[PDB]
Design a protein around this ligand. Structure first.
Ligand code: DCP
Ligand code: DCP
Ligand code: ZN
Ligand code: ZN
Lengths: 144, 310, 310, 310, 144, 310
């Protein structure tokens, strides 16, 4: 089960596990990798979890998990045993992973990384494109 | 002779409940018992001043299924001698000396009506005039509702999409309002709401209607879910994306739908009906399109024959 | 019912030797004994998403010679609602509720094949899909060879011109390779050589072929000289002039030609066949074109009738 | 150096009030004392990916008034037959090796911002990017309001017309909202109302605004009447007819206007402003256009010239 | 950790498990999944491993891995016992997952699933598109 | 006067090695010490009979960098509805009475040469004539190779892509073949091989060249990797798919490249060069484009200014 060093992120919701591996390139390394999926934890829909060997993620790297997996916990391993628990906060910039829903936005088919700004509302979250400067519900952005 | 013999077919507002029922009963009869020689030796003008491939093929097929011959044109950004100079009035005055009926589609409202004033005793059938009328679409819609529901009264009808600019939904609402006990559910963004004059018309007849922001609110009760395209051409792309999700339909949405419920759409349907709806028993937009043939046959037959032995 | 009843006609690769012979025997019968009412009351869609006047007129004439009615369109750089948005799949799903068969030509490879997946029980006939197939051209070619040579086996067939990009010669070579003892002569500049996959296919069947730089090398032995246009559009004008002379045919070149030898060309033929060839008894490209009518009639008849009394 | 030296000018939301004041003060100076050789030996690209004759001439005139040389183009023609398959990124990467500054207008939102990521040390000035920003229009508007009213604070500003889709009024509102005590009156049909996000921005800032059905409701207290074109291509022609009167201005409407009031319009005004307004002392749309030169000079001067203007 | 009833895909070429999960949507279920990439590989140099409970792969599904892990080993397990091991063999047809390299093929942006006839050649595999009837090296198809 | 004073610049085959060296040395000088008034009071015609935004802006920028004024046009629009029935001869006869030099690009080969016969004492600079010459492209290429490699002799030069139809690689090869000890590597699909006449020219000069199927075969010994666009409009899309990989470059392909190696490309590179190449020290296509300015200045300066540049 356990790894000597690297990182383990836990308490990932069901069906969000694979999406993290996808979006965040979370498995793109010659270093060792072990993942568990649809794992039993506590609730009926339960949990996914990931473990990564010999690699560490910055505090900023943690924060990107917020939009999909708010309730997680990232965990550093240095010998066998843990060091510190970590929690993702809403970042100020979500870059690279989202796609602007504005079909006329210059960002499409150009060599730039997507970039959005975040702010809360009743019933949803507004995301604002760096390029077109248009603002959308996350529920609009997260469906394309 | 039958009430529609030699009548012009211009506007849903000119057709009574009895007229509608007569077209539909005739359509059912020709569907069951085709009469491929009814209009033998008739020549019909297919005049698409405004091109519409789907509507034109449907109408021309109807003509051929009754044995009629067809002449016509479909016009893009052009004309020969001498329209763009020659009036529509003169064009109809000429063509009406050639043919037995004129089917026409045109970019300006009122074009078919003006045509009747110059076509002498040649009946004009309106295949669409600008943002005004499209009565044979409404007839095929109504035929499809009647055929699948067994009736045109006491129905729950939801309309979803661009209700402000869809001449097809205005016309269908007017038509359905000629029958009793129908209830309407309008699902549209505020910028594309069903127009007040439609709402006033329903109010004056004591017909119930309500607004809903989501298909889920009405799915359990709806008999007919009529989807209409979004005229995104008038809209900012950003705006079109912010309210896309409100008229998108997919198979999962039909989970609590009544066994009888049908999804209609005058087409094309990109971005509104996911392809996964197609295989469900509720998807009926292709069957709807196929019904255009029988509705349009009935209309041609009624208009061009005194009495139909069916 | 006959082996082709209600079958789609998409690719030469899907037709067996027996299928080919059946189409050709039927074509000979209709040529000798026309059946102008065979397809009475059938409606056929002539759908040229890509325009081709020669192919469309040929196909539509075939339809009328069997008594069928025809609806359709020819498309330039356009479309009405709502292709360029509406999928080909939806277009076929609609049109197949109207008509008894769909003849279609399209700029993308595979278009006819995709159509069969949406047309239900309505047969699709491929009038050409991009650089892929054009099976009714190959059928009319084969009918012409059989009619003039009395057979499709043990022939000497030369092909001259742009062999690399001519879908018509690829298809004819595949078709002829379903018969026995044929020998091929390929006459083309190096830049436009018959593709290796064609050559491999002939190798695998032990079919003899050879390259020649001039028509003179093969004239004494050739039964069929099949000329194909040069797609000069892909070429530098200077390049097109340096190797023009290698595929130009004139009357003097036919001096030692066999009495039976025919010159074929799917047309148009500018710059390849001098007009002086036209009057020789070997010129058979117009007769070839006229044969399209009988080949296409046979196909429509076989596909739309269970059993043909001929 | 001055605060704007070598800065990109992309969006009004990136310019502080001090920035705006600096541009306007610089504009006032150049109007009063021209500096025809300030940018001698600079070469500026006038890149109109989207064509705009009025805006381009204004900008290129401003370049020449400071002695700069100009190279450029105007497309809108290249669209989708290929337009330019090359990325904007690459176009900018190339052009930024040629010139000292890039002025660009583009049909896609974000285009100028994208340019800055590829232009190296070459400043980019946004002449309009889709329905997003148009800051030099806002700068000449502000300069015109400041000149005629003596201030940018404590004004009564009415905006009329298509408030929904006008990038120019969105931007002017944001800009005026950076100053204090301004009150807005929004006059627009419901289909064309000032968007919620603008209203919300005003609410956070505790800025007063009100909705009005017509111009006469507020004519007696406005300092600036800023009219906009109604993009009638968005509306139904009958819909346009019915709301037309509320956003059209004629001279008799001006009876109770303050002596200091000016009517602005970014042009063309063909429908909204009658020509009898032209000779009133309130008509200031042509003077407005003229100030584009001084605002655009100020911006070029500030961005390309290290030391502030005297 | 080991499994009672289901399927184990072993000797997966390294860094490929994730891909297999993507292409074949293996994570689109509720059944418990266990994955390892570049793992403790006595029986390899660098290999991947995927476990899926209460689910079984038919012969064809197993064969669909042939192009991505031709030396994998698929284990069928019940009552903790491995009841069957099979190796991927070259399928004759490959559907859904590949994309036709011909940019003019009708398959792009039409509601159909890709489909290719497969035939082995000396040094590569030839793949022929059902729609456009063009044939490509698997190296060309797999490239994109 | 300098050797190039008042000379026409039409073809690389008319420029000696000393001419090439003189242009490059002049270009180096102007890059180092600009002379913004050298051509003050000259007026130069920028005549783009065939449109080319990148080449035109480069040329017009170079004119302004020396202080010259510019008049001009860009057609490609006028084609065959009339284009201009006037002869090129007459157009030049007229224009050569207006201006001090003519820079021209034309779709027909020989056009610039023809111009010189009608331009009187007005020099003509060829900005590209059909598939013939493009000497200022070759001059900026050479300048870029000399700058980054320190020499034009004893280099390892790889050319990749459409070697058959690229006027730019034909011309660069001829140019490099005027210097000594250069070795070429030609990487192209068979349908797009370097033409025989180029290979024959190299053979007479005893210059080494070899054919290679891919870039990796020679990546470790090349000094210049000169990539070209594959005119995909010539190939079948499936054919393009199958050979694509051999003429596309990405960053990982560069692992064993010499430290001094530069990747050049006359642009656009949309397909052939991945964007991850851009930030390697080998990417030099944008710097290449930038050198167009200095090469084009040098040429204008040499041709219009009697005394050599200091
Ligand atoms: N070499 C190691 C050492 C530890 N772990 C991890 C796996 C478990 O996720 C974690 C267990 O410790 P926790 O603090 O996460 O357990 P909790 O206290 O969080 O459980 P609970 O939240 O239910 O109280 O240790 C690991 O993967 N590898
Ligand atoms: N209840 C079980 C039984 C087996 N396995 C896994 C472990 C191995 O990775 C694979 C094969 O099981 P084996 O017992 O056959 O292990 P082998 O060492 O025999 O595999 P191989 O035949 O390749 O040597 O399946 C499992 O996860 N759960
Ligand atoms: Zn955006
Ligand atoms: Zn394909």
């Amino acid at each position: 089960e356990a790894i000597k060093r690297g990182t383990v992120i836990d308490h990932i919701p069901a069906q969000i596990g694979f999406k993290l591996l996808s979006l965040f390139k979370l498995t793109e390394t010659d270093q060792r990798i072990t993942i568990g999926l649809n794992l039993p934890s506590g609730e009926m829909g339960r949990k996914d979890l990931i473990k990564i060997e010999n690699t560490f993620l910055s505090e900023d790297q943690v924060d990107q998990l917020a939009l999909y997996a708010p309730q997680a916990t990232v965990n550093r391993i240095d010998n066998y045993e843990v060091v510190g628990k970590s929690r993702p906060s809403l970042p100020e910039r979500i870059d690279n992973v989202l796609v602007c829903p504005n079909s006329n936005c210059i960002s499409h088919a150009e060599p730039v990384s997507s970039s959005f700004a975040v702010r809360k509302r009743a019933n949803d979250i507004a995301l604002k494109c760096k390029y077109c400067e248009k603002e959308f519900s996350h529920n609009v952005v997260l469906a394309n | 002779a039958n009430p529609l013999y030699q009548k012009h077919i211009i506007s849903i507002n000119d057709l009574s409940r009895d007229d509608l029922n007569l077209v539909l009963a005739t359509a059912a009869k020709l569907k069951a018992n085709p009469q491929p020689e009814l209009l033998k030796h008739k020549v019909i003008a297919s005049c698409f001043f405004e091109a519409s491939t789907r509507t034109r093929l449907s109408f021309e097929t109807s003509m051929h299924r009754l044995g009629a011959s067809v002449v016509g044109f479909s016009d893009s950004a052009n004309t020969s001698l001498g329209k763009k100079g020659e009036t529509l009035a003169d064009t109809i005055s000429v063509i009406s000396t050639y043919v037995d009926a004129i089917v026409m589609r045109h970019p300006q409202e009122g074009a078919a009506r003006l045509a009747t004033e110059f076509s002498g005793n040649v009946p004009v059938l309106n295949a669409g005039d600008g943002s005004n009328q499209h009565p044979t679409q409404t007839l095929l819609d109504l035929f499809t509702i009647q055929e699948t529901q067994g009736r045109l009264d006491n129905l729950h009808v939801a309309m979803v999409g661009d209700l402000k600019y869809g001449r097809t939904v205005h016309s269908l609402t007017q038509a359905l309002a000629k029958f009793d006990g129908n209830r309407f559910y309008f699902i549209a963004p505020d910028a594309l709401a069903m127009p007040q004059y439609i709402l006033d018309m329903l109010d004056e007849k004591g017909i119930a209607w309500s607004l809903h922001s989501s298909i889920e609110e009405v799915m359990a009760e709806v008999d007919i879910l009529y989807m209409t395209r979004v005229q995104k051409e008038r809209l900012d792309p950003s705006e079109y994306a912010n309210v896309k999700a409100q008229f998108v339909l997919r198979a999962s949405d039909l989970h609590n739908a009544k066994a009888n419920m049908k999804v209609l759409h005058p087409l094309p349907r990109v971005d509104e009906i996911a392809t996964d709806v197609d295989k469900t028993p509720h998807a009926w937009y292709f069957q709807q399109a196929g019904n255009g043939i029988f509705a349009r046959q009935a209309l041609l037959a009624l208009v061009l024959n005194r009495d139909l032995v069916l």
